[PDB]
Amino acid sequence: RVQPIKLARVTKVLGRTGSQGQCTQVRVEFMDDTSRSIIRNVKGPVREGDVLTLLESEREARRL
Amino acid sequence: PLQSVQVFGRKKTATAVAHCKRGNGLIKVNGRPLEMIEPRTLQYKLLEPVLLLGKERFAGVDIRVRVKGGGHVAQIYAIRQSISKALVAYYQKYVDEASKKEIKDILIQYDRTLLVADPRRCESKKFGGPGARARYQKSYR
Amino acid sequence: TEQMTLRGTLKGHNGWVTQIATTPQFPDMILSASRDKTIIMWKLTRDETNYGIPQRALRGHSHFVSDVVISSDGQFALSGSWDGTLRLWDLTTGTTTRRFVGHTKDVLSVAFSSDNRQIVSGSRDKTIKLWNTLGVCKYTVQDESHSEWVSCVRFSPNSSNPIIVSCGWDKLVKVWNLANCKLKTNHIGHTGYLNTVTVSPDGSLCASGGKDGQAMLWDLNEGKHLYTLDGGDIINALCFSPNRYWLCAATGPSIKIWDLEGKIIVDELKQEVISTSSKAEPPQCTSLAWSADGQTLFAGYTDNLVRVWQVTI
Amino acid sequence: TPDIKLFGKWSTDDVQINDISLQDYIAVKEKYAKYLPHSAGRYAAKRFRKAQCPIVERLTNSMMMHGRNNGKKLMTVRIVKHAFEIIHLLTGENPLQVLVNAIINSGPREDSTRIGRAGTVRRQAVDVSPLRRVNQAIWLLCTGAREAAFRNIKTIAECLADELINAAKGSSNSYAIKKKDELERVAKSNR
Amino acid sequence: AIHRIRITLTSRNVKSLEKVCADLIRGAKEKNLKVKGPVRMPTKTLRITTRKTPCGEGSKTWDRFQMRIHKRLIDLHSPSEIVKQITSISIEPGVEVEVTIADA
RNA sequence: AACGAGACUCUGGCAUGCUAACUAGUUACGCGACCCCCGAGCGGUCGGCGUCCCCCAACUUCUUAGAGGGACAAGUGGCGU
């Protein structure tokens, strides 16, 4: 939220979701500890080994 | 012997036959200097190989080119592609392998189809629409 | 005993080295052909920066160049190519002296005589043919010939002997006599089809091979089956040696260098391991040739390299 | 390096990327320097192939819209030579460093999307690819200058160079940095 | 006398044409008249692009038809008698031939 | 087993290999003529710029059209029974 901006990187891509395939599920490692991992929903066309810029990590996702 | 090797360039119908003959300096295109050729906003582009490779591969040749075909843009890519390729062929044939091998490596690093020809050419119009893929409007009721 | 060390490796091709031959005028050069449509004339060094660099690459053929051979003079060179035609080079810069037009299909094998006026060719036209060095057909052999493709032909020492070797895929070795063009003999003894044949420089032997698996030996002086050895699963090249009486056999994963006095294997050349899955670790060896010194030999492989070895005592 | 190409006046070294999340999606200096932003290019036929062509080239491409400027890419390079010139005089920075900052400050970090549930509109907040950030950021700042010069005495060159200053700074007096925060303001709400 | 005589061939069938050209180059070379080989000229396209429907109705479709003619010419220089001899022989398929009085 | 599918035909992208060219070009000089010192030099001479001159010159890269060759998931690494 108002906590410092986070950075987390892809470990694996899972598959595309959304109601037109518009969203992409991905599994990400938190890039400050690899024992911490969350699944996210990401809009853009992601690949492997890319880094993202999360504005929170309070949220936890698994589908929309 | 009489040192002369000829090459050509292509880009979507635009031939530019560039003979490389022994000499020194005096590179031309269409019997004109290539220091101005007239769009001259893309002027940095045809100069690009000469500038990047230095003047020390052009230290013993006169290259001259005749052109035809294409528009203003496609001609620039054709003449550039020809003089680049001319230089390579000349060293492979009258000097030695290791002479041209260096020069080949330099060009293909910043490749911009400097040793190959663009395959792409226009596709035919088929009826029921303008262009080669667009369609006229279709109204229901 | 004498054994082999891995000397070095050359690099210059983008395709499989098909044949190599060696100028005896200059052991400084060496010549090669390949399946990327070029014959490379090399400039060798014994250095460690390189063992050699390609000097030039003669170009003109529209298909692979199968076999290549030097002239007695060493200033000409002759070629056989998978385009169905031959060219006669002037080994300096290029500039073909002559191109030979005949043969319906490919020219697999080619050779250049001691007299420099007779040139033969094996073709999938099913023809042995004789060639003036003006590039016209002195004779053509098509009657009493093989009914299958002619694999490799050879010139034999013309000490007083007018004989030239021929071997086809019909499981036969035909010997032909110059200026009568008859069968001198037919030799049978290969289960598989014959790839190659070669004659000793002394001139008493014919080392022949194929997909027989066994390497059988024939006599150049009247045609007798001298003896046989088990080895050489697929035989692609053979080459006698000038400084020893050896015979060097080209199998796919390995080269088997054989002493014949008495019959024994000297060494087996193996290349260092490379981890592959499922299995693609061997590259096929297809050609080999001795140098004049007979200390060093070179080999053509299908990994696009010419591997060098050297005999150490 | 001893044959280093400029733009014909600008260094492609001394160009920083201030993210580790956007470096290697900015192309400006690995060997991507060229004297012009015109090429035959390959921007298609494989998905990962857009990120391999310069940022300066991408810029020229994306400012030629609205149905009368298409097929006039040569006119577009005229606008770019003036743009950088004005940016360098105006603040003093190497005008490529300006552009890289302008891209990094304008990219949205979360965006919303649609989801159909119960026959009523629900929205979901989601994140974005680095490749998405670049595509968006190049679009947005170019929209400002395109709009501004559409009935003004000011020329398109002047408008575009002004917009890259206010983007490269955190000023928030631009069409880009306005709309960037608008999107994020939605993404907080329906998070 | 020896006149520069040009034999133009023209047809619609490239096989039928070409073998008849070979025959006329043969009959010339047989008598060593120092003939010049075929000079194959640009093939020309007749096009007709028209509606497939009689009385418009349904989707608008057309149909490209084409006929390709072929021209090629052999230059001879020899006596006009032996020319008309070799011309008239060894021609069977529908292929036209045109003999010329003289050329420069 | 058959039809449709693919196969096929036409078209486009690859040949300094082959075949041959005053109704297609190039190169080479010979040039003589014009031109300017335009370049080394001096304005001479040598070279550059195109046209007429060109040949019973040389050649076919460029233009042309025929026969052929080339591409197969072929090779390598993953994955799949």
Strands B4-7 and B32-33, sheet pairing: unpaired
Cα dist. C252→C17, C152, C271, C299 in Å?
13, 19, 11, 11
Question: Judging by beta carbons within 10 Å of its beta carbon (0-12, 13-18, 19+), is residue D129 exposed, middle or buried?
Answer: buried
Contact between C56 and B97 using a beta-carbon 8 Å cutoff = yes
How far is CA B45 from its chain centroid? 10
Contact between B42 and D8 using a beta-carbon 8 Å cutoff = no
Give the separation between CA E88 and CA E82, rounded to whole angstroms.
10
- Which bases of chain F are contacted by protein, using any atom under 7 A from a CB? 12-23, 26-28, 48-50, 61-70, 75-78
- 3-class SS at C310? strand
Within 10 Å of residue D47's Cβ, how many Cβ atoms?
A: 10
- HEC states along B8-34? CCCCCCCEEEEEEEECCCCCEECCEEC
- 3-class SS at D68? coil
Give the separation between CA C105 and CA B123, rounded to whole angstroms.
38
Buried b (16+ CB within 10 A) or exposed e, A5-34: eeebbbeebeeeebeeeebbbbebbbbeee
With a CB cutoff of 8 Å and minimum separation 6, the contacts of E76 are E4, E5, E6, E7, E28, E33, E35, E36, E83
Diameter of chain D measured on Cα atoms: 66
Within 10 Å of residue C217's Cβ, how many Cβ atoms?
A: 19
The parent domain of residue B119 ranges over 1-141
Give the separation between CA C288 and CA D67, rounded to whole angstroms.
67
Q: Chain B partners of C44 at a C-beta cutoff of 8 Å?
A: none
CB E53 within 8 A of CB E2: no
Q: What is the dihedral of CA C312, C32, C13, C60, to 10 degrees?
A: 170
Q: How many residues does chain D have?
A: 191
DSSP string, chain E: -EEEEEEEEEES-HHHHHHHHHHHHHHHHTTT------EEPPPEEEEEEEESSSSS-SS--EEEEEEEEEEEEEEEEEEHHHHHHHHHSS--SS-EEE--S---
Q: Strand pairing partners for D31?
A: none
The parent domain of residue C22 ranges over 7-313
How wide is the angle at C-alpha C198 spanned by C-alphas C269 and C306, nearest 5°?
A: 40
Phi–psi pair at E17, nearest 5 degrees: -60, -55
CB E94 within 8 A of CB E77: no
DSSP string, C213-225: SEEEEEETTT--E
Residue B96 sits at the chain C interface (C-beta within 8 Å): yes
Round and report the angstrom distance from CA (B30) to C1' (F36).
19
Resolution, expressed in angstroms to one decimal: 3.5
* Residue C1 belongs to some domain of the structure: no
Closest CA to D125 of D44, D39, D190, D37: D190
> In this structure, which amino acid lies at residue C257?
I
With a CB cutoff of 8 Å and minimum separation 6, the contacts of C197 are C152, C154, C165, C167, C173, C206, C207, C208, C209, C238
CB C131 within 8 A of CB C121: yes
Report the gap between the CA of A32 and the closest CA in chain D (Å).
14
Give the separation between CA D61 and CA D39, rounded to whole angstroms.
11
What phi-psi label fits residue D61: left (phi over 0), alpha (psi between -120 and 50 degrees) or beta? alpha
- Residue D151: DSSP 8-state: S
Give the separation between CA B75 and CA B77, rounded to whole angstroms.
5
Phi–psi pair at E54, nearest 5 degrees: -90, 110
Give the separation between CA C273 and CA A38, rounded to whole angstroms.
43
B108: domain CATH number? 3.30.230.10
The token duo for E46 is 């007749």
C100: domain CATH number? 2.130.10.10
Cα dist. D53→A49, D19, D29, D34, D37 in Å?
20, 19, 11, 11, 10
Strands C94-100 and B28-29, sheet pairing: unpaired
Residue D42 sits at the chain B interface (C-beta within 8 Å): no
Neighbours of chain A (3+ CB pairs under 8 A): D
Contact between A64 and D47 using a beta-carbon 8 Å cutoff = no
The token duo for D157 is 């060159």
Give the separation between CA C80 and CA C103, rounded to whole angstroms.
11
Cα dist. C209→C12, C256, E24, E64 in Å?
29, 13, 51, 61
Contact between D113 and A18 using a beta-carbon 8 Å cutoff = yes
CB B49 within 8 A of CB B107: yes
Q: What is the dihedral of CA C132, C138, C142, C145, to 10 degrees?
A: -70
Give the separation between CA C178 and CA D86, rounded to whole angstroms.
87
The token duo for B48 is 């690009």
Give the separation between CA D182 and CA D108, rounded to whole angstroms.
9
Within 10 Å of residue C18's Cβ, how many Cβ atoms?
A: 25
With a CB cutoff of 8 Å and minimum separation 6, the contacts of D180 are D105, D106, D107, D108, D140
The token duo for B60 is 């013993």
Give the residue carrying structure tokens 């060097």: C248
> In this structure, which amino acid lies at residue D122?
R
Give the residue carrying structure tokens 């697999």: C108
Q: What is the dihedral of CA D69, D73, D79, D85, to 10 degrees?
A: 170
Give the separation between CA B44 and CA C213, rounded to whole angstroms.
65
How wide is the angle at C-alpha C120 spanned by C-alphas C117 and C124, nearest 5°?
A: 155
Contact between D8 and B45 using a beta-carbon 8 Å cutoff = no
The parent domain of residue D20 ranges over 1-191
A 24-63 residues with CB < 8 A to D: 40-47, 50-56, 59
Is the bond preceding residue C300 a cis peptide, omega within 30 degrees?
A: no
Question: Judging by beta carbons within 10 Å of its beta carbon (0-12, 13-18, 19+), is residue C68 exposed, middle or buried?
Answer: buried
Gaps in chain B after residue (C–N beyond 2.5 Å): none
Write C98-105 long-range contacts (CB < 8 A, 24+): C98/C133, C98/C134, C98/C135, C99/C60, C99/C135, C100/C131, C100/C135, C102/C129, C102/C137, C102/C140, C103/C127, C103/C129
Contact between C93 and B93 using a beta-carbon 8 Å cutoff = yes
CB A9 within 8 A of CB A49: yes
Q: Strand pairing partners for C94?
A: C90
Measured over the CA atoms of residue C225, residue C228, residue C233 and residue C234, the dihedral's sign is negative
Give the separation between CA C109 and CA C153, rounded to whole angstroms.
7
The token duo for C288 is 């080999």
Round and report the angstrom distance from CA (E49) to C1' (F71).
35
Give the separation between CA D144 and CA D163, rounded to whole angstroms.
7
Q: How was this structure determined?
A: cryo-EM
Structural domains in chain D (count): 1
- 3-class SS at D139? helix
| Per-state percent for chain D, helix, strand, coil, to nearest 5 | 45, 10, 50
Give the separation between CA B95 and CA B20, rounded to whole angstroms.
13
Buried b (16+ CB within 10 A) or exposed e, B61-83: bebbbebeebeebbbbbbbbbbb
Give the separation between CA A39 and CA A31, rounded to whole angstroms.
14
Phi–psi pair at E25, nearest 5 degrees: -85, -30
Q: How many residues does chain C have?
A: 313
Q: Chain C partners of B92 at a C-beta cutoff of 8 Å?
A: 56-57
DSSP string, chain B: ---EEEE---SSS-EEEEEEEESSS--EETTEETT--TT-SSHHHHTHHHHHH-SSSSSSEEEEEEEESS-HHHHHHHHHHHHHHHHHHHHHHHT-HHHHHHHHHHHHHT-SSSSS----------SSSSTTT--------
Give the separation between CA B84 and CA B107, rounded to whole angstroms.
8
Q: How many residues does chain A have?
A: 64
- Residue D185: DSSP 8-state: H
Give the separation between CA B99 and CA C247, rounded to whole angstroms.
39
CB D126 within 8 A of CB D112: yes
- 3-class SS at C52? strand
The parent domain of residue A7 ranges over 1-64
Structural domains in chain A (count): 1
Give the separation between CA C110 and CA C154, rounded to whole angstroms.
8
Q: Strand pairing partners for A24?
A: A16, A42
Residue of D nearest to A53 (CA): D109
Closest CA to A60 of A27, A13, A35: A27
Strands C94-100 and E96-98, sheet pairing: unpaired
Closest CA to C161 of C106, C102, C205: C205
Nearest nucleotide by C1' from C60 CA?
A: F17
CB A43 within 8 A of CB A35: no
Give the separation between CA D37 and CA E40, rounded to whole angstroms.
45
The token duo for D35 is 């004297």
Give the separation between CA D115 and CA D118, rounded to whole angstroms.
10
Write C298-302 long-range contacts (CB < 8 A, 24+): C298/C10, C298/C20, C298/C22, C298/C30, C299/C20, C299/C250, C299/C255, C299/C269, C300/C16, C300/C17, C300/C18, C300/C19, C300/C20, C300/C32, C300/C237, C301/C16, C301/C17, C302/C16, C302/C17
Q: Chain C partners of B102 at a C-beta cutoff of 8 Å?
A: none
Give the separation between CA E25 and CA B46, rounded to whole angstroms.
49
Structural domains in chain B (count): 1
Q: Structural domain boundaries of chain E? A: 1-104
CA atoms within 13 A on the CB side of B110: 23
